[PDB]
């Protein structure tokens, strides 16, 4: 389903889909505007086949599947007397950039700001502009806006290792980087490919760079070995540096170019500036290509595409870097181990004043939401068979202990704290534990009754990592050492050298300066601070601390002070935290 609408100057709007004979839609990466060509059936000999007229410079809109892809102005119009057809050529809005011609003087400006100013000077709407923190300095005299923006973004690309293009989509202007979007469709030989032609060329190869000063005399030269391995010949290039620029040689080298010319079946998503995937038939290998030129045609009820593709690299089988989703082993309550499992018998508890015992060990009113329970407490109820062997085999619990209770009921299973006091709450001879479950009303207790289950006690590690102990011990080993700026030896440490040494002792390499150290590892919050974390406070990280927990951390304060332990709250200036273990 393709629809074409035309807006005429007076205010009339026509739907001309039933008259169109042929449609073509195309673009290239070396021009800022896309083009649309179509024909309609119109006869002057026959009165029946006379149609409306579409004057020059009227807007035409192109829809595919209820989506607008093109909006532009009509530029050419032609009529042949032999054939009953009228031909049109339309252009995108992007050609308005090359009409402008302004003189600028840019000093130490961001490339994005340069593009924004150019778009603002000759009034144009901006959709989105690619971000790059590269500063540029240039003098433009009698140059287009398009050329200005492209030159600035080429200079930015010399650092970002990227490619950029200018796209005018409907009524908006955009600057995007090529290949960021990769299409879902893949071209395979046995499925949707009509024909292909692969080529390789050597003509535009460069493997030597010569730099000359502003006077013509040569200063330095360089050869690229990897390209020279492929081609035995030396093909040199000469560039000139002025006084205020220091050129980078490695950007000027150019290698062998590999391309493909493809014709097949696809969707309207395959346009210039996107990445596509082509599968090799013989080796069953997939390669990634960037689209440079495209053309879509609708005619006689069939739709075909033609692309010019530029090869980037071979897609790695499975995952190249093997990115795994970094997750903790346990979402909550990590390193629970040592939890010996004992069979238990569960009894229901109702809070009644007449019966008594509603007070706990500390004589506070019981709260059903606490999920507290009654288990034997050392010295409360002792029978005759509670021998030392039996006690070591079946250990009695303590007040406030956290035990895992599994009654077999949804909601009645979980960690239970031993706080409630219950008469005749002991352990049988076989080892079954009497655990009294607290309830908030009579009905729930009556429903629960007496059941048999299992409980877990005395299981907990509460550690973070083995290397944390080593690092903490080493940091304590360097306590009281005389301070020295820029010293990283057991004799004296600066603020960052301490953790450099400590984490090097556990094979963890970090930036020498603490400012860069802030830019390593996962972010850590103040409430998520654990032993071994790194804490940074001032906007300049003059001293970084090693967080050991308990609101304390180890560091080298400054010159004149010695390595000691500081309380975290005393440092009101907290900024962020990182973890690298």
């Amino acid at each position: 389903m393709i629809k074409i609408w035309v807006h005429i100057k007076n205010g009339s709007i026509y739907d001309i889909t039933d008259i169109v004979d042929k449609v073509s839609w195309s673009g290239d990466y070396k021009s800022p505007s896309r083009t649309l060509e179509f024909s309609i059936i119109q006869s002057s000999f026959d009165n029946v086949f006379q149609q409306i007229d579409i004057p020059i410079a009227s807007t035409v809109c192109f829809y595919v599947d209820e989506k607008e892809l093109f909006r532009g102005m009509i530029i050419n119009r032609s009529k042949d007397s032999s054939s009953n057809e009228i031909s049109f050529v339309s252009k995108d809005m992007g050609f308005l950039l090359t009409q402008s011609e302004v003189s600028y003087n840019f000093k130490d400006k961001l490339v994005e700001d340069i593009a924004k100013q150019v778009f603002a000077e000759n009034r144009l709407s901006v959709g989105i502009i690619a971000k790059t923190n590269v500063k540029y300095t240039k003098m433009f005299i009698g140059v287009n806006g398009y050329d200005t923006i492209m030159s600035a973004y080429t200079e930015a690309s010399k650092k970002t290792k990227k490619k950029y293009m200018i796209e005018a989509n409907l009524d908006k202007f955009n600057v995007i980087e090529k290949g960021t979007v990769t299409l879902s469709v893949m071209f395979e030989e046995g499925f949707n490919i009509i024909n292909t032609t692969f080529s390789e060329s050597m003509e535009n190869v460069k493997n030597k760079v010569i730099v000359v000063d502003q006077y013509g005399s040569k200063i330095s030269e360089k050869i690229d070995n990897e390209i020279f391995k492929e081609v035995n010949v030396i093909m040199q290039k000469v560039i000139q540096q002025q006084e205020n620029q220091d050129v980078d040689i490695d950007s000027e080298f150019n290698g062998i170019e590999k391309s493909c010319s493809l014709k097949g079946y696809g969707d309207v998503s395959c346009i210039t500036g996107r990445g596509v995937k082509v599968k090799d038939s013989y080796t069953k290998l997939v390669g990634l290509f960037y689209i440079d030129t495209d053309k879509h045609t609708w005619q006689n009820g069939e739709y075909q595409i033609e692309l010019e593709l530029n090869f980037q690299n071979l897609m790695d089988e499975k995952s190249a870097g093997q990115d795994e989703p970094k997750e903790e082993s346990n979402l909550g309550g990590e390193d629970y181990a040592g939890g010996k499992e004992f069979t238990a018998e569960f009894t229901a508890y109702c809070p009644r004043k007449e019966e008594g015992g509603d007070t706990d060990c500390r004589k506070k009113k019981l709260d059903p939401s606490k999920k507290t329970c009654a288990a034997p407490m050392v010295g409360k109820y002792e029978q005759t068979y509670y021998t030392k062997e039996f006690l070591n085999k079946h250990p009695l619990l303590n007040y406030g202990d956290e035990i895992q209770v599994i009654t077999g009921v949804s909601g009645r299973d979980g960690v239970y704290k031993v706080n409630d006091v219950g008469p005749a709450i002991t352990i049988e001879k076989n080892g079954t534990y009497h655990i009294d479950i607290l309830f908030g009303n009579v009905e729930e207790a009556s429903k629960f009754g007496r059941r048999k289950g299992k409980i877990i006690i005395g299981g907990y590690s509460g550690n973070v990592s083995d290397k944390a102990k080593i690092v903490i011990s080493e940091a304590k080993k360097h306590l009281g050492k005389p301070y020295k700026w820029g010293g990283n030896g057991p004799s004296s440490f600066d603020c960052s050298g301490l953790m450099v040494y400590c984490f090097k002792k556990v094979n963890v390499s970090l930036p020498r300066t603490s400012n860069q150290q802030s830019k390593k590892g996962k972010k850590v919050e103040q409430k998520n601070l654990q032993a071994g974390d790194l804490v940074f406070f001032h906007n300049p990280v003059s001293h970084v601390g090693l967080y050991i927990g308990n609101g304390e951390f180890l560091h080298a304060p400054q010159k004149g002070d010695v390595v000691k332990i500081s309380k975290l709250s005393s440092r009101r200036d907290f900024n962020t935290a990182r973890r690298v273990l």
Partner: protein, 346 residues
């Protein structure tokens, strides 16, 4: 290079070396004679390639790896069978003797001690796995079955989980342990080895060592748990055994745990309206135990009577005595202050 050396290359070179006038090609006499042992040489080259791989220590497979580590003296660790206890339920008087085998699923276990059902010593007897492995660490409430039917026994079950099962140490673990042992340097000289070895044991956070605590040739190590608190007997035993395994000849090692110091607090106070002695007593107990958690070394009298006056519900104070005195209680190492008895009078 052994890979390129192939039957075709060897044969071609051998034929080129021979200086005869006759025709050398497929189906000739000389070609037939030469071929046959060049194929064998091409066979031999692959074994020659593999030999240097199986020579080293990084990749020695299983048996030759055992020989190399036994040269270094490191032995492969074999598993130990799990240990557990089950209960026998049935008619009174049925006697279950040692060597009796019980079964759960396809695993087999042996009853260690003679046990009689309904006897005074109990119906629980030790259980040992017939084979090593981690798979024998059965959970609780597992119904065991008897291989040979003995009249009078109804049901076998375990009351706790099985523990002690260990698997066979593989090659990678052996190599890692060997590499860490050889890389590690352990001299007897400096005091740091003792604290290091103590720290190698889990459950320990702070370590203090006292040379010649009990005369020459005596060492007393002092381990501390989380927040410098008392460690369990298991961690103490593990630390003792590890330090013994790493200590050199000459010293004796003793490791102990902190002991609470008995503290008695007495005061005369005036309470606010609506507040009794018990509520302020509880609040003071909580605040003072928190302070004792945060305290280091000696106890300070001023903090004590400040925390007594800042309790909710107390209006005025007088005559606070800390263990019968107002002076600071200096606390030795490996000790903590604990409340014993409160004497508060309105």
């Amino acid at each position: 290079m052994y890979s390129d050396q192939t039957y075709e290359v060897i044969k071609n070179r051998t034929l080129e070396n021979i200086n005869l006038d006759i025709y050398k090609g497929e189906g000739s006499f000389l070609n037939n004679m030469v071929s046959g042992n060049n194929l064998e040489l091409s066979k031999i080259y692959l074994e020659l390639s593999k030999m240097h791989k199986m020579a080293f220590i990084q990749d020695t497979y299983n048996q030759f790896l055992d020989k190399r580590v036994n040269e270094f003296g490191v032995y492969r660790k074999l598993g130990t069978e799990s240990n557990g206890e089950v209960e026998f339920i049935g008619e009174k008087g049925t006697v279950i003797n040692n060597g009796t085998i019980i079964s759960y699923r396809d695993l087999l276990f042996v009853v260690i001690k003679d046990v009689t059902i309904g006897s005074e010593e109990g119906d629980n007897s030790p259980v040992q796995a017939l084979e090593v492995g981690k798979k024998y660490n059965l959970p609780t409430n597992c119904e065991f079955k008897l291989v040979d039917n003995i009249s009078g026994v109804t049901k076998i079950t375990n009351t706790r989980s099985f523990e002690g099962g260990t698997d066979i140490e593989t090659d990678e673990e052996l190599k890692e342990r060997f590499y860490k042992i050889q890389r590690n340097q352990a001299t007897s000289g400096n005091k740091a080895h003792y604290e290091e070895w103590a720290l190698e044991v889990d459950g320990v956070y702070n370590v203090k060592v006292y040379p010649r605590w009990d005369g020459p040739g005596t060492v007393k190590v002092l381990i501390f748990g989380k927040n410098n608190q008392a460690v369990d007997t298991e961690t103490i035993e593990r630390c003792q055994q590890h330090i013994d395994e790493e200590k050199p000849i000459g010293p004796t090692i003793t490791v102990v745990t902190p002991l609470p110091i008995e503290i008695s607090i007495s005061a005369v106070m005036k309470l606010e309206d609506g507040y009794t002695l018990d509520n302020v007593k509880e609040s003071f107990l909580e605040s003072i135990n928190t302070y004792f958690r945060d305290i280091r070394g000696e106890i300070i009298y001023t903090k004590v009577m400040g925390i007594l006056i800042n309790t909710t519900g107390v209006h005025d104070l007088s005559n606070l005595l800390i263990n019968g005195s107002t002076d600071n209680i200096t606390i030795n190492e490996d000790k903590i202050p604990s409340v014993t008895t409160v004497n508060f009078s309105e």
